UniProtKB/Swiss-Prot annotation, chain B:
The protein's Enzyme Commission number: 3.1.21.4
Name the record gives this protein: Type II restriction enzyme BsoBI
GO biological process, one term: DNA restriction-modification system
Chain positions of site Interaction with DNA: K77, R127
Keyword flag ATP-binding: no
EC class: hydrolase
Assembly and interaction partners: Homodimer.
Keyword annotations of the record: DNA-binding, Endonuclease, Hydrolase, Magnesium, Metal-binding, Nuclease, Restriction system
Amino acid sequence: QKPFENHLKSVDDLKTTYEEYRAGFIAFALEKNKRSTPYIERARALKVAASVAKTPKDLLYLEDIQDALLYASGISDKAKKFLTEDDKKESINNLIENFLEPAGEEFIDELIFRYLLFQGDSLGGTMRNIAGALAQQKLTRAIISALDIANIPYKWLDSRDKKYTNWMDKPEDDYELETFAKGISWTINGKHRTLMYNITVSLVKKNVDICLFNCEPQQPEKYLLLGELKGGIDPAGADEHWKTANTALTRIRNKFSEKGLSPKTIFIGAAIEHSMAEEIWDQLQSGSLTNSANLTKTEQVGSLCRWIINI
Amino acid sequence: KPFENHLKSVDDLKTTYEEYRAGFIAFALEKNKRSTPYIERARALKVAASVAKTPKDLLYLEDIQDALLYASGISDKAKKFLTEDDKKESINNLIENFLEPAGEEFIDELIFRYLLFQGDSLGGTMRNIAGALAQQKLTRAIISALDIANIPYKWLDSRDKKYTNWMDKPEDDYELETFAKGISWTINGKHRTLMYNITVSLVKKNVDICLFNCEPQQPEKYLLLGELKGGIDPAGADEHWKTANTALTRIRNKFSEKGLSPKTIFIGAAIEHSMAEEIWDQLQSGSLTNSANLTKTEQVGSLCRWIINI
DNA sequence: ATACTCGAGTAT
DNA sequence: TATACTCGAGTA
């Protein structure tokens, strides 16, 4: 009856299975290896460039490698934002005095090894963002397939076009269209619906993963649904990012209610553990959350998407 | 209102750019200190791996198999979900996809890959170190508060996991905070015990800071429960506060159910404007009992003096 | 800006 | 030991 009751019969219907977790970790590793090559090649290139220095101090004169030297000195690009030029030069001198000179004849590999060791945290950062985008793509693929299977045309917004205004008609074969869709728009029963991802919602003044608008492809009454989408596969992060999402959804509910609005709210997650599953179920029963789906379970995702399209 | 002793406005909670810059510099210093064992393991891996004349030969050096798996793109966290065959397969992919194609440079290909992936491991280690150091800073503030007030205390060594050997404060407790899992004292007849990272029975969740009405379950023995965030990254400020807020809500919810109203606190090193407004609102409404910005000594001292007198 | 992406470790 | 803690590497 209730939307979620179509694909959820018990609390643990929401729980991610052991096989789904192993599959996710394997796919994450495959993508990590695919993404790794440019990092190793940049390290190979750095060694070629740095190798013209005959002494660690000589590295200070190869302007082409100074950013790499700052990185190898233990400064992430996130940290670099907070350092003055002096701090940066000092960090590089520390690398030269504390590690490169002491490595003596092995100073070039000392540099390359440190540059890779710290760049590994950068690749890790990149991979966490990649996992997020792939999750969004998976949900979009489920949404457009649901429209396609129902013979409902739609328009889409290309994430590459930052004016984010040119709504294009669905191509004949929308194979992999989800790779670049920032939003999807359709009409069902006369009503126009526009789904957008990662939008700043003015009433809460916070970004929201999923937003469904009552409007042909800001005005609080136009928000039909707001939802959080967690594509992480790590069970150790399941409750962590659910605690985060729950405050996000409460900020939403609080601000909208103040205005007399009750938009629908949803939570979709690939890593769902027992405790958090109990809380999601309680919220669905109490009406505080409108629907939910475990992203690794096709039938749930499909049911939720068909429901979304008909809202 | 306890918090009014050290907070006059919402922005008194906000971290300054100078404290952020100082935090980032201190994190980098610690990272460089912790980096050496990683590079040395890479040097040692190269020495051991060098015996192989071909990438396939690496499969026979039993001593490097774990490093091979790691270099193949498998974090220790992911490793837990892999079967032995998954692992074998991962290592073969490394051999076929990267080491054979590197030809003559195959050993460095392996070492470079081992380090690149191990960098995420060092990042993991550093995030946990940052947390521990934040806990130590708060403990230092608490023991100094007791010392300056001439109040003895006993302490629990985090070093042996038994967590039962409560010891008398030493004459000089210099750096005692480095290994204290808990601190216990008596003030005006009341016995108080502070413990860190305890699983709290009623919520069935871990809590950063617990104050017990008990000399060194029983949900009613809980005087205070608090969240402590030692992160210095402003980009993680709202993120970890959103998390903390659900943790504190679960606490309030489960305890009220039982007719209990333990005090609650939030201490954070990275506090931004938006979350500062929400913390301020909760302090004003009585939902949150006290708060302090960990980078501001006067706030931390005022909060710790208040904690000791609860 | 401002606050999003999520898993690298860790502990009880 | 099942469970959930640590926090910043990126990103927009």
